[PDB]
Write a protein that binds this ligand. Structure first.
Ligand SMILES: [Cl-]
Length: 116
């Protein structure tokens, strides 16, 4: 099994939320979202880091405007998606729908699945 040093840490979850709040490229879209779509954003920041997610300007813009389909289509074109497509497809469904369909849940259990 995984080393204890390599497991999911609640504090790293909290670091992702802090990172969102203190980045003007992230907090406005987070604030605009419902709780389930917020979990998708937390996941993405947890995985690739604050700076990286803040680079997704076009797609976050779409999310902030409730343009769910356009956001999902755009996110699936990224290098991120092609790197980790199973995970990205789950996160994208969560952004698109505001449901846990892709995990059938809460942010911790979502990450517990995605981190493996
Ligand atoms: Cl994957």
């Amino acid at each position: 099994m995984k080393d204890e040093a390599e497991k999911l840490f609640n504090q790293d979850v909290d670091a992702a939320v802090r990172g969102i709040l203190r980045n003007a490229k992230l907090k406005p879209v987070y604030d605009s979202l419902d709780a389930v779509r917020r979990a998708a954003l937390i996941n993405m920041v947890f995985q690739m880091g604050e700076t990286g997610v803040a680079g997704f300007t076009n797609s976050l813009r779409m999310l902030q405007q409730k343009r769910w389909d356009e956001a999902a289509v755009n996110l699936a074109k990224s290098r991120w998606y092609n790197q980790t497509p199973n995970r990205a497809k789950r996160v994208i469904t969560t952004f698109r729908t505001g449901t846990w369909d892709a995990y059938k849940m809460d942010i911790f259990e979502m990450l517990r699945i995605d981190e493996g």
